[PDB]
Write a protein that holds these residues in place. Structure first.
Motif, PDB file in Angstrom:
ATOM      1  N   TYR A  72       0.884  -1.137   0.000  1.00 29.91           N
ATOM      2  CA  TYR A  72       0.000   0.000   0.000  1.00 29.91           C
ATOM      3  C   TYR A  72       0.931   1.197   0.000  1.00 29.91           C
ATOM      4  O   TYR A  72       1.798   1.277   0.870  1.00 29.91           O
ATOM      5  N   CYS A 286     -11.992  -1.797  -0.836  1.00 28.55           N
ATOM      6  CA  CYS A 286     -11.969  -1.665   0.625  1.00 28.55           C
ATOM      7  C   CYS A 286     -13.362  -1.782   1.276  1.00 28.55           C
ATOM      8  O   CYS A 286     -13.541  -2.571   2.214  1.00 28.55           O
ATOM      9  N   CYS A 332      -7.513   0.281  -4.395  1.00 28.32           N
ATOM     10  CA  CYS A 332      -8.242   0.283  -3.127  1.00 28.32           C
ATOM     11  C   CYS A 332      -9.666   0.803  -3.284  1.00 28.32           C
ATOM     12  O   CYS A 332     -10.623   0.164  -2.844  1.00 28.32           O
ATOM     13  N   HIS A 333      -9.806   1.956  -3.926  1.00 23.35           N
ATOM     14  CA  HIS A 333     -11.105   2.562  -4.087  1.00 23.35           C
ATOM     15  C   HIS A 333     -11.102   3.382  -5.376  1.00 23.35           C
ATOM     16  O   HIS A 333     -11.048   4.622  -5.378  1.00 23.35           O
TER      17      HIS A 333
END
Ligand SMILES: [Zn+2]
Length: 409
Positions: A72, A286, A332-333
């Motif tokens: 990340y 997420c 992630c998004h």
């Protein structure tokens, strides 16, 4: 705005309207033949975009925080990407880039966290395979122990992906899968798995979930549902054969836990960030459908029940209508991470409908930066920024072999 965005009420506000026509034979032809290979024309565009985004990335990465070596956001994440690129393109330069980034990520250890995405396992696992590929058993072997030892530093770890136990097992699988032989003892794996099962039934009893759901988990004062921090994350991992949960416990503990989650679904088909949430608006990996879907598809593979598959179809549909986020193109998004949801369905089903959707999302990404989205906080990172987007595009090239990275297995 930062700040005060009025996109707070429902998920349609958070997405651009999907302007692509839906699947049919004619429109599909252009992206792939009946064998589900991408037309060279189409691959050419992808590859061309990949090549060029890398210049932007490589350039931007010159400004990235030297201190952050995580998967990340940090260096190890870039290493992850490059290794994947070297696998799809065969270009030796990529292996050299990957070496260089791993080296940086090794000077960022903090013995703080155990995960692949945000902990030291990221740099460790990734280093171990990278050394393996450069025939360097000195470092690689020593790395592996350094990662084996790593769990001792947090006996009261959460259980989720970004900070929890499963996020650590990913580091563990990464190594095993990429080496070929069992470089990490299966004992080390099961016992950590064991401590996450028993921890999950204790919590469901200290709470009165035990009836409603035999297992329960929480991170940072919430019962997280999604993939990043929550249940769908954890159960997906528990229904993974690699982890070997006794057929017995599999049916008596985890199945109804999963069924609990399914029943949390909104009327829209989406899923709440946490239990009790009423606001139906995040369409992310997420949080929301795009992370929950992996749980559904696995449940299907494991229990062969029409309702699981059927729920997963429902996800895909939500994501098709609402997965192009104003939030950007990230894993992630963002749009790219969202598209992996189609690939995952496709690789279970062989329904070319779903390969088609991925390609159209990919299509949205070839316009990276035209839609007027916010620039992400780490604009070039694996999970917040460009690296993930590239990662996905490259991964799309051989649809059959595509996995959501640092997670899917
Ligand atoms: Zn996110």
């Amino acid at each position: 705005h930062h700040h005060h965005s009025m996109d707070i009420e429902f998920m349609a506000q958070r997405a651009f309207p999907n302007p692509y026509a839906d699947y049919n034979k004619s429109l599909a032809e252009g992206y792939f033949d009946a064998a589900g290979r991408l037309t060279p024309e189409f691959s050419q565009r992808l590859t061309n975009k990949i090549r060029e985004l890398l210049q932007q990335m490589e350039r931007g990465l010159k400004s990235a925080d030297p201190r952050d070596g995580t998967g990340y956001t940090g260096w190890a994440g870039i290493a992850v990407l490059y290794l994947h690129l070297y696998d799809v393109f065969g270009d030796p330069a990529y292996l050299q880039l990957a070496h260089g980034y791993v080296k940086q990520s090794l000077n960022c250890l903090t013995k703080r966290s155990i995960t692949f995405l945000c902990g030291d396992a990221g740099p460790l696992a990734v280093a171990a395979v990278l050394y393996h590929k450069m025939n360097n058993e000195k470092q690689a072997e020593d790395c592996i122990t350094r990662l084996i030892h790593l769990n001792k530093i947090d006996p009261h770890a959460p259980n989720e992906m970004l900070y929890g136990r499963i996020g650590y097992i990913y580091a563990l699988l990464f190594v095993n899968k990429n080496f070929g032989v069992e470089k990490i003892p299966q004992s080390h794996i099961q016992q950590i798995c064991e401590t996450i099962l028993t921890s999950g039934e204790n919590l469901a009893r200290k709470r009165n979930f035990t009836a409603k759901s035999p297992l329960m988990y929480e991170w940072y004062q919430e019962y997280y549902v999604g993939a990043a921090h929550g249940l769908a994350g954890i159960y997906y991992y528990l229904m993974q054969p690699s982890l070997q949960v006794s057929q017995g416990k599999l049916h008596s503990l985890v199945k109804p836990s999963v069924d609990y989650v399914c029943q949390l679904k909104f009327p829209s088909g989406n899923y709440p960030p946490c239990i009790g949430d009423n606001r139906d608006l995040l369409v992310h990996w997420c949080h929301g459908a795009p992370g929950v879907i992996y749980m559904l598809i696995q449940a299907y593979k494991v229990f062969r029940e029409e309702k699981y598959l059927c729920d997963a179809y429902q996800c895909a549909d939500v994501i098709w209508q609402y997965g192009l986020l104003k939030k950007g193109y990230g894993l992630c998004h963002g749009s790219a991470g969202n598209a992996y949801a189609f690939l995952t369905l496709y690789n279970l089903t062989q329904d070319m409908k779903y390969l088609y959707r991925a390609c159209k999302f990919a299509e949205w990404c070839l316009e990276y930066g035209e839609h007027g989205c916010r620039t992400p906080d780490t604009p070039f990172s694996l999970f917040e920024g460009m690296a993930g987007t590239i990662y996905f595009l490259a991964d799309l090239l051989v649809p059959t072999k595509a996995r959501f990275p640092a997670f899917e297995l």
